Amino acid sequence: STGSATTTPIDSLDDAYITPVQIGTPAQTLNLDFDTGSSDLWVFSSETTASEVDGQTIYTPSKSTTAKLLSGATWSISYGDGSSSSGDVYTDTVSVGGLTVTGQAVESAKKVSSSFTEDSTIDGLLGLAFSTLNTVSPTQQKTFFDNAKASLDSPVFTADLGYHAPGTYNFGFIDTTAYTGSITYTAVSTKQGFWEWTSTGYAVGSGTFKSTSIDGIADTGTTLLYLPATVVSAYWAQVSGAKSSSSVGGYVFPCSATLPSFTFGVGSARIVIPGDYIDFGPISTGSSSCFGGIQSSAGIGINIFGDVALKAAFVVFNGATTPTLGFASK
């Protein structure tokens, strides 16, 4: 089997991408944030505290003839940005782009943190990291991909995120028309539960490539590119007037600037992030100070190849017995 679904930016900045997901019978379609940095499929629901729902579409398990409460199961998650959610668990039929999993754990939120409530465009998350990170207790549950894998034509999914435009998540096949050149594959460590890999270096604009190992995670659920402070300083030094602002929370730059590209290495291959992809717009409405799309990871503990990086590539998440990642230009 295969599946293919379009993923759409939630706003004009590509702050996140939403993909429609069919849950239950008859189908209830929710727009979920596919997140290769986490491993829970959780949704706003008829069980979510009413004051914490503000425009999201909800899953109502009592209206699904295939929903079954997973007795005694609860979940609770906290993300790297400070947000969190928790609740109970159903199993139900879940389909993405024509690919159907029966008995998928659907984690129904009873509580969500304010950042979720405040974003009416995201109805929940669909985790695509390794199932070892799934938070369901006392019996950990499998991700959608883990459940589908054995049925897929090939045990892979691909992320093809658009810049200021829709893109595609495919399951079970490589669309060889979706990229240019070849796909360069690189080793993955699953020891932390992430799609963790090592970039071979970087360049700023037309500058020389710096060969240096940068361990990080391929994370579709993170907006920005978080890299070591040395790398980030070298980038923003090429933007007149750019500076790190403690009060804003990162590097800012004059909105009048033209940003240089940023290149990262995948083996001997190179992925070029155009400068425009690094512009996240005014820090507050009407400001002439703009927020940068490359930020320091120094306070995180891990480097994160988020959407800023991934949207410049066609990315293969190869879930073979020994997982690997592939990157192609497009």
Side-chain angles (χ1 to χ4, degrees), residues 1-62 64-67 69-109 112-141 143-148 150-190 192-242 244-330:
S1 62
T2 63
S4 179
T6 297
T7 193
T8 300
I10 63 166
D11 62 23
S12 65
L13 297 176
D14 299 346
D15 281 317
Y17 298 79
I18 49 173
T19 309
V21 178
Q22 281 72 49
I23 309 177
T25 310
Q28 301 178 38
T29 299
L30 275 65
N31 297 329
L32 305 188
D33 185 350
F34 282 24
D35 181 11
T36 63
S38 68
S39 305
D40 287 50
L41 192 176
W42 75 259
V43 297
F44 278 80
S45 75
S46 57
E47 302 176 332
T48 308
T49 299
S51 65
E52 297 180 354
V53 184
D54 186 8
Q56 295 81 10
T57 294
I58 62 167
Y59 171 57
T60 302
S62 65
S64 174
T65 58
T66 42
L69 182 68
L70 185 62
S71 180
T74 59
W75 63 280
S76 181
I77 190 160
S78 307
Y79 296 102
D81 63 349
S83 63
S84 62
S85 53
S86 62
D88 57 11
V89 186
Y90 292 81
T91 58
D92 210 341
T93 302
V94 172
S95 298
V96 176
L99 170 65
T100 299
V101 168
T102 60
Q104 174 64 46
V106 177
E107 302 173 34
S108 165
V112 303
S113 70
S114 60
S115 64
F116 290 111
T117 300
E118 291 164 2
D119 180 8
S120 67
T121 71
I122 289 175
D123 302 324
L125 269 65
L126 189 151
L128 293 166
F130 294 87
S131 293
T132 55
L133 296 181
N134 176 266
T135 78
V136 176
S137 180
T139 306
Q140 190 170 65
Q141 301 294 304
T143 71
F144 176 79
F145 178 56
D146 221 344
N147 282 322
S151 302
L152 296 177
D153 290 357
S154 181
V156 305
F157 68 92
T158 65
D160 179 10
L161 301 179
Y163 166 67
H164 293 180
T168 305
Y169 281 102
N170 290 330
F171 292 83
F173 72 105
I174 305 303
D175 179 359
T176 62
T177 74
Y179 56 86
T180 64
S182 75
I183 306 175
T184 295
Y185 289 86
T186 197
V188 165
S189 173
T190 66
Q192 297 187 70
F194 300 124
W195 293 92
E196 187 171 2
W197 65 290
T198 302
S199 173
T200 50
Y202 69 98
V204 175
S206 59
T208 64
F209 187 83
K210 175 71 168 182
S211 290
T212 183
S213 292
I214 303 172
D215 297 337
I217 66 168
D219 185 2
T220 59
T222 291
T223 312
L224 305 187
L225 174 52
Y226 294 89
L227 291 174
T230 48
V231 178
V232 175
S233 180
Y235 179 80
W236 289 109
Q238 299 305 311
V239 180
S240 279
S244 183
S245 166
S246 57
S247 61
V248 175
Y251 279 88
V252 297
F253 67 93
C255 294
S256 60
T258 300
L259 297 179
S261 64
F262 183 88
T263 298
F264 63 95
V266 182
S268 57
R270 306 290 179 253
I271 299 295
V272 180
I273 305 170
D276 288 351
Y277 290 26
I278 299 160
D279 180 359
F280 281 75
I283 60 171
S284 290
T285 303
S287 179
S288 71
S289 185
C290 274
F291 197 66
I294 295 178
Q295 297 293 347
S296 179
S297 65
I300 297 178
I302 198 160
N303 300 305
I304 306 174
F305 293 88
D307 297 335
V308 163
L310 303 182
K311 75 178 71 180
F314 177 89
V315 187
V316 180
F317 294 81
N318 169 26
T321 302
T322 299
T324 64
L325 279 165
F327 292 82
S329 292
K330 66 188 184 190

